[PDB]
Design a protein around this nucleic acid. Structure first.
Ligand SMILES: [Mg+2]
Ligand SMILES: [Mg+2]
Ligand SMILES: [Mg+2]
Ligand SMILES: [Mg+2]
Ligand SMILES: [Mg+2]
Ligand SMILES: [Mg+2]
Ligand SMILES: [Mg+2]
Ligand SMILES: [Mg+2]
Ligand SMILES: [Mg+2]
Ligand SMILES: [Mg+2]
Ligand SMILES: [Mg+2]
Ligand SMILES: [Mg+2]
Ligand SMILES: [Mg+2]
Ligand SMILES: [Mg+2]
Ligand SMILES: [Mg+2]
Ligand SMILES: [Mg+2]
Ligand SMILES: [Mg+2]
Ligand SMILES: [Mg+2]
Ligand SMILES: [Mg+2]
Ligand SMILES: [Mg+2]
Ligand SMILES: [Mg+2]
Ligand SMILES: [Mg+2]
Ligand SMILES: [Mg+2]
Ligand SMILES: [Mg+2]
Ligand SMILES: [Mg+2]
Ligand SMILES: [Mg+2]
Ligand SMILES: [Mg+2]
Ligand SMILES: [Mg+2]
Ligand SMILES: [Mg+2]
Ligand SMILES: [Mg+2]
Ligand SMILES: [Mg+2]
Ligand SMILES: [Mg+2]
Ligand SMILES: [Mg+2]
Ligand SMILES: [Mg+2]
Ligand SMILES: [Mg+2]
Ligand SMILES: [Mg+2]
Ligand SMILES: [Mg+2]
Ligand SMILES: [Mg+2]
Ligand SMILES: [Mg+2]
Ligand SMILES: [Mg+2]
Ligand SMILES: [Mg+2]
Ligand SMILES: [Mg+2]
Ligand SMILES: [Mg+2]
Ligand SMILES: [Mg+2]
Ligand SMILES: [Mg+2]
Ligand SMILES: [Mg+2]
Ligand SMILES: [Zn+2]
Lengths: 59, 136, 49, 79, 126
RNA sequence: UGGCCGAUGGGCCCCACAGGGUUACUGACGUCAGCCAAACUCCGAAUGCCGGUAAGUCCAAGAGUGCGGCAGUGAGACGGCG
RNA sequence: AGUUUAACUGGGGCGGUUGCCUCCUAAAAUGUAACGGAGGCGCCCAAAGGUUCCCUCAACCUGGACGGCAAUCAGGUGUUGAGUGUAAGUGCACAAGGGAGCUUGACUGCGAGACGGACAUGUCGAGCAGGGACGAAAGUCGGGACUAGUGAUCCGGCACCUCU
RNA sequence: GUUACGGCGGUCCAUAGCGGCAGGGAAACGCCCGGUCCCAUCCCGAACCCGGAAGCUAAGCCUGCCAGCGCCGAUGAUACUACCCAUCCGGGUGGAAAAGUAGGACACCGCCGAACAC
């Protein structure tokens, strides 16, 4: 499987741990499209940063 | 003029009032009672005044209760002293109250007179309140 | 002085090896103890001074 | 008006210092408890000041037995 | 009609026996190579077990109950000496030589001392 | 805070060494129930932290730790949270 | 004549404090201020140390008389509600609580590794060599149940040495 | 193999404790009989220790039964809270208590050693 992740809100003024998790995801600038594996761990990542990202599911 | 007659220490920190009043949330003892609405302080003077208002009108029949008791002290630094230099001295005692608490409890024959007395008690109280009966 | 200051010496040695404090008011008799001091290499009672 | 309070102590920084399942080496301290909040177990030493440590490499393991708290070290298998 | 208004001597006695054995048991860390030798004495018999606390399982034991040892008309010093010799030789057969002794809650002296000695000069070094 | 037997206020109208607050008191204990506590906890989390494993950003953050040259700063403010 | 005459401070001054220890504030790792809330320390100890052994209360009903509400008691529910050198917290009945016997480990030189420290320091610690202590032995013994009872450097005094 | 037996043991040590009731002496267990010799009473053979088994299981122990009390404990809800929010004002997802409630419940199990049977 695969996931399309795109940050929809800026990182500014967000909890430091959330910012670091965003870096882990690998989104530098707002509205970047990134493809990632559908693991439980990345699912948890998206769940945590859900208020900043939208998920489009591919495959 | 209710006051604890001895405690471990004569002063206490500021309060947290957040939270719904759980203790005594339902009338039990008599057959009628008040129930407050909003968080607030209640001074010993206020409690005593309400007790007088209830009692003197009810006169002979029935007997009252007071589910609360002002315990926590308070202080206010006298005027003309730049703030600092330690805690002030205690002035009055207050009993906390949370939404839904029952303040007074009555067992008198007639609902009308019970309501009337408790209404005067409400008017003399500092925070909103309303009648409530024993029923489920 | 509430708690005087006492030294202890070996016999063959005579070396101020151990020092300890006492209440002279309640102990007017001199202190005796069996202990060790290194150089003569074996235990031996130490005296007061 | 004057205050008679306002003095305090130092901060000894007590508390458990190697947590359950960690890997500790010989002579390693485990806890610093004023009272006997815990109790020694096999391969644990009772310090001069109610402190707990380990007398052999291994992984620390807490556990309740007889309704108390006692620390112990399981020697991790030699690779 | 019986109404208890106090405590009981024998009950507190058994509790105290367990208590006092507890001090030593606390320390004892006796493995297969160094099992703990437990001694129990009755008003009529003596019992001894050699166990490794690691598994809480015994290795060898004997007591005044066995018919051959009861065949000894003597008293409990002699009974204890014979039983201790049996423990020693059974432990030797099983292949254990160095062990630790448990005071079994009783104070040393008399029958316990006789058992200890018998075990000592029977070849059981502990 | 309000109730219950309450002998015995652990005690009183005559003190008999013996009947009643024959008298409204006190009534201890305990028990029925209803609150309160930063220095009370027979209870007890989401969080935070430390330890182990695994995936990911791995044309590098420009990630960490140590050592070495360099100065600043040790007058904070506000807002949200306790 | 050359100089000294503190800081903290909700402006200064007068008051009070200046180090150390306990708890709370402290947001369940540590830590975390205030002239915030509350209390103590500048010791004691040849035993109140070590070890071996014995044993465990207080609460409880009754009183040959003093003697009583309480002095000592035993019968026979008895689980710390009593206590544990000096405050509080943490612990403590498997005792850290008493008694006794003995006796000095309140040893000597080191110290695997750690804890805390901005730094100087401060804390814990299994094992190794001599000797000793208690216990037949197993083992425990490097000060007190722990956490306060403290002072750097210089200058000087005193003893021993296979230093010059 | 059974046992209405004794020691040692276990266990996020009370579902395992306490209370009342009934029953056990073949062996073992207790109580028990007496203190020359061991040993002890800060006096006492009360404790311990020692010699013996005349007696009895009342006490204690054990087992069985009782829900009187302790005790464990749902689902559900409520309190609480991580993160985010909308011009305060409380909701969205995640986490999910305490107490109370139906209920459960008068321990289970390991190794050896004793009486009946093989
Ligand atoms: Mg508040
Ligand atoms: Mg608060
Ligand atoms: Mg009002
Ligand atoms: Mg010296
Ligand atoms: Mg502190
Ligand atoms: Mg209630
Ligand atoms: Mg609290
Ligand atoms: Mg606590
Ligand atoms: Mg925290
Ligand atoms: Mg980890
Ligand atoms: Mg780069
Ligand atoms: Mg550099
Ligand atoms: Mg520079
Ligand atoms: Mg500065
Ligand atoms: Mg500054
Ligand atoms: Mg500043
Ligand atoms: Mg600041
Ligand atoms: Mg400001
Ligand atoms: Mg802020
Ligand atoms: Mg000049
Ligand atoms: Mg100034
Ligand atoms: Mg000012
Ligand atoms: Mg001024
Ligand atoms: Mg903390
Ligand atoms: Mg600061
Ligand atoms: Mg003082
Ligand atoms: Mg001693
Ligand atoms: Mg008695
Ligand atoms: Mg002691
Ligand atoms: Mg004692
Ligand atoms: Mg080293
Ligand atoms: Mg040696
Ligand atoms: Mg040592
Ligand atoms: Mg010491
Ligand atoms: Mg010590
Ligand atoms: Mg100088
Ligand atoms: Mg028989
Ligand atoms: Mg006798
Ligand atoms: Mg019976
Ligand atoms: Mg009995
Ligand atoms: Mg319970
Ligand atoms: Mg039960
Ligand atoms: Mg559920
Ligand atoms: Mg937000
Ligand atoms: Mg709003
Ligand atoms: Mg629950
Ligand atoms: Zn010498």
């Amino acid at each position: 499987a695969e996931l399309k992740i795109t940050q929809v809100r800026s990182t500014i003024g967000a909890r430091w741990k959330q910012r670091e998790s965003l870096r882990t995801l690998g989104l530098k600038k707002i509205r970047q499209s990134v493809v990632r594996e559908d693991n439980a761990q990345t699912r948890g990542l998206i769940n945590t940063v859900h208020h900043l990202v939208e998920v489009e599911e591919v495959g | 003029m209710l006051i604890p007659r001895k405690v471990k220490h004569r002063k206490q920190h500021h309060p947290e009032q957040r939270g719904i009043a759980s203790g005594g949330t339902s009338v039990s003892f008599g057959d009628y009672g008040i129930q407050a609405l909003e968080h607030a302080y209640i001074t010993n003077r206020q409690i005593e005044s309400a007790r007088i208002a209830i009692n003197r009108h009810i006169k002979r029949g029935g007997k009252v209760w007071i589910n609360i008791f002002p315990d926590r002290p308070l202080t206010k630094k006298p005027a003309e002293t730049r703030m600092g230099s330690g805690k002030g001295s205690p002035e009055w005692w207050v009993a906390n109250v949370k939404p839904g608490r029952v303040l007074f409890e009555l067992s008198y024959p007639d609902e009308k007179t019970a309501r009337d007395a408790l209404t005067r008690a409400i008017h003399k109280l500092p925070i909103k309140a309303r009648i409530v009966t024993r029923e489920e | 002085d509430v708690r005087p200051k006492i030294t202890l010496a070996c016999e063959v040695c005579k070396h101020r090896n151990y020092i300890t404090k006492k209440n002279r008011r309640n102990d007017p008799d001199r202190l005796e103890i069996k202990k060790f001091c290194p150089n003569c290499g074996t235990h031996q009672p130490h005296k007061e001074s | 008006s004057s205050s008679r309070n306002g003095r305090d102590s130092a901060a000894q920084r007590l508390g458990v210092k190697r947590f359950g399942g960690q890997v500790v080496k010989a002579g390693e301290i485990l806890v610093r408890q004023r009272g006997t909040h815990f109790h020694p177990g096999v391969n644990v030493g009772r310090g001069g000041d109610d402190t707990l440590f380990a007398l052999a490499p291994g992984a620390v393991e807490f556990g309740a037995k007889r309704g108390r708290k006692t620390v112990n070290i399981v020697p991790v298998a030699r690779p | 009609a019986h109404k208890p208004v106090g405590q009981n001597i024998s009950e507190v006695r058994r509790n105290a026996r367990l208590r006092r054995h507890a001090r030593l048991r606390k320390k004892v860390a006796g493995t297969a190579e160094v099992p703990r030798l437990v001694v129990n004495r009755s008003a009529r018999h003596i019992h001894v077990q050699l166990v490794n606390d690691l598994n809480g399982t015994t290795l060898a034991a004997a007591s005044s109950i066995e018919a051959d040892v009861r065949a000894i008309d003597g008293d409990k010093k002699a009974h204890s000496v014979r039983v201790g010799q049996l423990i020693a030789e059974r432990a030797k057969a099983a292949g254990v030589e160095t062990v630790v002794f448990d005071r079994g809650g009783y104070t040393y002296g008399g029958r316990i001392a006789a058992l200890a000695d018998a075990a000592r000069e029977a070849g059981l070094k502990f």
